[PDB]
C-alpha cells in the first residue's frame, strides 16, 4: 500500500526553536520545555516556551480562583468526604441565585453568592485571555484575526451567562457550574422555549457546526493529499502558488464546479467556525426576551 502522512515515519529533532522576536518582550518568555516523542509522531515534539505577561498572569489567577471557588463549593456539597467527591464529581452543581433575588449581588454565599463570585472570576479570566490573544499577535506584527474569532465564542458565553440573564431580570436564568447540571439546563432551556430546533438561529448554528466539520475534513484531507508537493506550507503557496495549490483547487473545481485559493480557503474556514457561535448567540439572546415559543413563532412568521 502507499503511506498516508497521518503519522510521521521518521521523527527528526534539532536545536529548539526559541521563536521570532519582533516586538515580543523576551523577559516574559519562559525557558524551553522538554521534547515529547509521543507528540512528535503526530505534530511537533517541542514543548514551550510560553509567554506570560501582566494580563496572562491575571487571567490565570482569576481562572484558578474560578476553579477553586467551584471546587470549594463541590467539597462542601460532598461533606468534605473524598469518597463522595469522586463519586458525585459530575452531579455537583454551583447554581445561580433563585429568581427571588433578581439581579441583586446580595445573595448569601450558600444560595447563589458563591456562583456570583465564581462568575466574576470567570469574567475577568476570559476577558483577560482575550486581551492576551490580541497582545501576543500585536507583539509579533500579525493581524488580529484570532482575537476577532475568539470574540465570537465569548459572545455566546456572554449571552448565556450575563446579557440574557440581565435582560430577563434575574441571575437565576444563567448557566450553573456543573458537568451534568449544565446539560440539564440546556435541555430545560429548549423545553421552556418551545423546542429550540425551531429557532432558525439554532438551525443556522448547526449548519455551521456541521459545516465546520465538513470544511475541516475537506481541507485537512486536501492539504495532506497535496503534502507530496509541500502544500501544508500554506503561506509560501499564497505568496508564490505551487502545483500543490493548483492541484488542490482543481480537485474541487472538477468535483463540485468551484474552488478556493490557498488564502481564501482560510477565510471560508474562519467564517464557517465564527458563524457557529455568532448565530447561536443571537438565537439564545432572543429566547425569552422576544420569543417565548419557537415552534409557535415558526408556524405564523
Amino acid at each position: 500500500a502507499e503511506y498516508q502522512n497521518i503519522f510521521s515515519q521518521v521523527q527528526v529533532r534539532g536545536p529548539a526553536d526559541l521563536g521570532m522576536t519582533e516586538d515580543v518582550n523576551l523577559a516574559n518568555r519562559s525557558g524551553v520545555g522538554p521534547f515529547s516523542t509521543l507528540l512528535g509522531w503526530f505534530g511537533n515534539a517541542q514543548l514551550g516556551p510560553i509567554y506570560l505577561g501582566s494580563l496572562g498572569v491575571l487571567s490565570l489567577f482569576s481562572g484558578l480562583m474560578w476553579f477553586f471557588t467551584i471546587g470549594i463549593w463541590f467539597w462542601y456539597q460532598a461533606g468534605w468526604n473524598p469518597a463522595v467527591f469522586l463519586r458525585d464529581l459530575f452531579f455537583f452543581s454551583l447554581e445561580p441565585p433563585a429568581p427571588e433575588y433578581g439581579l441583586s449581588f446580595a445573595a448569601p454565599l450558600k444560595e447563589g453568592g458563591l456562583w456570583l463570585i465564581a462568575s466574576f472570576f470567570m469574567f475577568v479570566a476570559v476577558w483577560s485571555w482575550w486581551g492576551r490573544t490580541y497582545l501576543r499577535a500585536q507583539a509579533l506584527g500579525m493581524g488580529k484575526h484570532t482575537a476577532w474569532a475568539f470574540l465570537s465564542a465569548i459572545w455566546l458565553w456572554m449571552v448565556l451567562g450575563f446579557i440574557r440573564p440581565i435582560l430577563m431580570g434575574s441571575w437565576s436564568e444563567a448557566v450553573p457550574y456543573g458537568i451534568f447540571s449544565h446539560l440539564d439546563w440546556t435541555n430545560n432551556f429548549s423545553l421552556v422555549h418551545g423546542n429550540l430546533f425551531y429557532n432558525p438561529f439554532h438551525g443556522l448554528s448547526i449548519a455551521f457546526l456541521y459545516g465546520s466539520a465538513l470544511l475541516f475534513a475537506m481541507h485537512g484531507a486536501t492539504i495532506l493529499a497535496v503534502s507530496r508537493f509541500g502544500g501544508e506550507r500554506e503561506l509560501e503557496q499564497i505568496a508564490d502558488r505551487g502545483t500543490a495549490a493548483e492541484r488542490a483547487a482543481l480537485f474541487w473545481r472538477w468535483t463540485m464546479g468551484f474552488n478556493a485559493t490557498m488564502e481564501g480557503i482560510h477565510r471560508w474556514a474562519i467564517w464557517m467556525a465564527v458563524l457557529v457561535t455568532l448565530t447561536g448567540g443571537i438565537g439564545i439572546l432572543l429566547s425569552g426576551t422576544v420569543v417565548d415559543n419557537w415552534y409557535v413563532w415558526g408556524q405564523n412568521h
Partner: protein, 281 residues
C-alpha cells in the same frame, strides 16, 4: 472554461472503469463513469421525491416529507405511497454518494494526489448508512430510520432522542460533541492564524510560518505545526462523525433505557454507593 493554470492538468488517465469513454469534463465538472452514475442516481431520486410530493399534495419544500415504511413493515419492501418511495430514494442516495466518492478517487488519480478526501467523505456516508441502514436493520425495521423532509427529520431527531430521556447522557454522544466543538475551535484558530500571518498589521511584511508557531507557543506553550494542524482537523472532524455513528448504533440495539442510568456504573458502585451525603446519598 478553465482556470488560467488548469490546462496542463487536463490529460487523459486515472479512470477505474470505462477507460477513456467517460474521460471528459462538462464546464468545470469532471465526469467519468461515476459522474454518469451519480447523475443517474441523483436524477431518479430527485424525480421520485417529486412523485412523492404530488402524492402528498404540496410543492413547498418546507412541507415535503418522504417517510420510511411504518415499523410494522419490518425490513420488507412497502408500497410506493406507504414507504417504498423512501426505500428507493435511499438506494439512490447511497448509489449517488458512493459514486461521488469513486469519482473523487478518479480525480485524485488524474491529478496525482492522495486519496484522503474520498476516504474522509466515506465517514460521512457511513454516518448516513448508520441512521438509514445499519441501525434500522439491527433494530428490525426501516421505520426506525429518519424521514426525508426539512423539518420532519428534525422532529425525528427530537422523538428518537426523547425516547432515551436526555440524549445528552449518551457517553458516545458526549465524546462526539466534544470533537465537534473542538473541531470548530480548531478551524477558527487555523483560519485565524494563517490569515493573521499572510495579512499582518499595516506597514508590515508578510509573516512566515515561524511567526505562526511563535504565536501559538507564546499563547499556549505549544505549536502543533503546519502538517500537524491539518492532521488534527481531519482527525477531529472524522472522530466526531465516528462517535456520532457509534452513539446511535448502540442506541436501541445494546442500550434501551434512559441514558442517565448508564452513569450508575460510577455512582451506585458498592463501596461509596451507600455513604451518606453528596447528591446521591
Amino acid at each position: 472554461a478553465l482556470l488560467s493554470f488548469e490546462r496542463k492538468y487536463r490529460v487523459p488517465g486515472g479512470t477505474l472503469v470505462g477507460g477513456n469513454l467517460f474521460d471528459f469534463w462538462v464546464g468545470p465538472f469532471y465526469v467519468g463513469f461515476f459522474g454518469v452514475a451519480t447523475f443517474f442516481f441523483a436524477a431518479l431520486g430527485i424525480i421520485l421525491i417529486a412523485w412523492s410530493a404530488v402524492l402528498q399534495g404540496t410543492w413547498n419544500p418546507q412541507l415535503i416529507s418522504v417517510y420510511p415504511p411504518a415499523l410494522e413493515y419490518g425490513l420488507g419492501g412497502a408500497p410506493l405511497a406507504k414507504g417504498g418511495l423512501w426505500q428507493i430514494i435511499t438506494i439512490c442516495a447511497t448509489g449517488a454518494f458512493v459514486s461521488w466518492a469513486l469519482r473523487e478517487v478518479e480525480i485524485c488519480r488524474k491529478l496525482g494526489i492522495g486519496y484522503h478526501i474520498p476516504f474522509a467523505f466515506a465517514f460521512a456516508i457511513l454516518a448516513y448508512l448508520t441512521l438509514v441502514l445499519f441501525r434500522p436493520v439491527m433494530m428490525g425495521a426501516w421505520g426506525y430510520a429518519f424521514p426525508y423532509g426539512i423539518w420532519t427529520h428534525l422532529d425525528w431527531v427530537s422523538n428518537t432522542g426523547y425516547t432515551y430521556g436526555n440524549f445528552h447522557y449518551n457517553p458516545a454522544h458526549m465524546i462526539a460533541i466534544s470533537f465537534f466543538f473542538t473541531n470548530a475551535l480548531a478551524l477558527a484558530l487555523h483560519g485565524a492564524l494563517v490569515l493573521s500571518a499572510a495579512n499582518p498589521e499595516k506597514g508590515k511584511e508578510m509573516r512566515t510560518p515561524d511567526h505562526e508557531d511563535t504565536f501559538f507557543r507564546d499563547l499556549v506553550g505549544y505549536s502543533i505545526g503546519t502538517l500537524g494542524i491539518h492532521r488534527l482537523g481531519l482527525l477531529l472532524s472524522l472522530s466526531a462523525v465516528f462517535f456520532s455513528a457509534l452513539c446511535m448504533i448502540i442506541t436501541g440495539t445494546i442500550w434501551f433505557d434512559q441514558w442517565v442510568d448508564w452513569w450508575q456504573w460510577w455512582v451506585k458502585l458498592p463501596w461509596w454507593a451507600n455513604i451518606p451525603g453528596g447528591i446521591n446519598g
